[PDB]
């Protein structure tokens, strides 16, 4: 049905040797994989050069944050418009660390969302509930808050190509991630919440698991109806990447 | 005295073809200038890119922000041992444009400054005032408070190797650049007022003037005794930075 996407979301972790070195092992270690699709985000300085390293395999490009300016009088923001001139298809918006370290809203990031749909990017919007919430019983209602940013103001056509990735903050380099069944009764809610507006839409739209996902557990999760990948954090940056990326895909061709 | 700076700040512009176009015919244009030290800041995806392409000649390269974390689970965080690796040594912090739209602080862009230094970077800090605190009068107590976060929390030695540029807010993008008389008036100030604290540093604090510089007032500016380079915005783009150097180059070897 949805083709799964597995994308690693580098964060404050890069190098010139790092970039050389994982990237080139991932392009001859991810040679004829196609079952699953593959993104790395490195950070910004860095999507030049491992997107001339990934050049001959199929890893595409990702970036974990734009600003709503395209070009002028902007400085030291990250305009979308260069994000696609470099190569990047992919980009994190509202990950929790935008949204608590930089206090970045639901409004603000549904712009976000609004400005890669609107240039030809695939935004990976996060959402996810804190433990506090999660607790309390409203996983339903922060989600559904937070996917409705965009959904009850551009409507369900902007999910038309996007990728939601739900990371329950309780478990974001925690290590504690969420119960296979866990995980797919979020997505499930996800997806039947974007189908009550369009279920068309719903149906395509890639909902990936994050929130502590590594070798072990990449196979429980994947065998869930509505976990349609992952977003890697921690692993992203160790050789067990690869195993969570054949996870998606030998299950994929089922 | 003091060996002139002309950083030239891209703002939020620039491509692949630019960044090659821009770039080799400044490296080609600048062969031999000596009087001048210069600094490009491309926007953060293109700083390899350009450092590549400088690379034979002496353009130093920059960047347009830093955030306060070296590595880690900071999705979206520019990092100065990061910026340090892809090979960028001027990084401005406290732009007008992120005090405003982005609302930085005081207290964070003094942060910024005490990482970028204990990494090794030199901060270009702008400072400045806007019209309305102009005419009330208010330049002397604007700056000297944006120049005292830092220097009441880490003391006159953070400006050791620092440089400051006073851009007065008034004067970014209108046209309309302070006089020399009224740009040579406030470097004296700066000045003045960190030598009341220490001499000796002093004398060494690049002081840059920005504000609608170009090639026609770079050389009348030049000539102020305090006013030790430029940090251009809008003519970066143009081939009239390498009149802008010549002028800050041919005044220095008077």
Redesign the interface.
């Known amino acids: 049905m949805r083709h799964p996407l597995v994308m690693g979301?580098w964060?404050?972790?890069?190098?010139?040797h790092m970039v050389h070195e994982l990237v080139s092992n991932l392009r001859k270690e991810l040679a004829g994989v196609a079952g699953c699709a593959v993104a790395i985000a490195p950070?910004?300085?860095?999507?030049?050069?491992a997107k001339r390293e990934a050049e001959g395999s199929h890893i595409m490009l990702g970036?974990?944050?734009v600003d709503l300016?395209?070009?002028?009088?902007?400085?030291?923001?990250?305009?979308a418009a260069?994000?696609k001139?470099?190569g990047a298809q992919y980009i994190?918006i509202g990950?929790s660390?935008?949204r608590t370290?930089?206090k970045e809203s639901d409004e603000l990031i549904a712009k976000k969302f609004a400005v890669l749909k609107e240039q030809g990017l695939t935004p990976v919007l996060c959402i996810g509930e804190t433990e506090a919430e999660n607790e309390a019983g409203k996983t339903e209602e922060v989600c559904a808050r937070q996917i409705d940013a965009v959904l009850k103001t551009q409507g369900a056509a902007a999910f038309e190509g996007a990728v939601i990735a739900y990371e329950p903050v309780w478990a974001?380099?925690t290590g504690k991630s969420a119960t296979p069944a866990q995980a797919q009764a979020v997505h499930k809610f996800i997806r039947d919440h974007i189908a009550k507006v369009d279920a068309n839409i719903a149906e395509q739209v890639i909902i990936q698991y994050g929130g502590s996902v590594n070798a072990s557990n990449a196979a429980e999760l994947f065998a869930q109806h509505d976990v349609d990948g992952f977003l890697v954090?921690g692993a992203s940056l160790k050789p067990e990447f690869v195993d969570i990326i054949n996870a998606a895909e030998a299950a994929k061709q089922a």
Do not use: V, W
């Not at 964060?11 to 010139?16: A, E, Q, T, V």
């Not at 950070?43 to 030049?48: K, L």
């Open positions: 979301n964060k404050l972790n890069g190098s010139r950070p910004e300085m860095y999507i030049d050069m970036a974990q944050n300016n395209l070009s002028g009088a902007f400085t030291g923001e990250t305009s260069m994000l001139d470099i994190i990950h660390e935008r370290y930089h974001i380099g954090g």
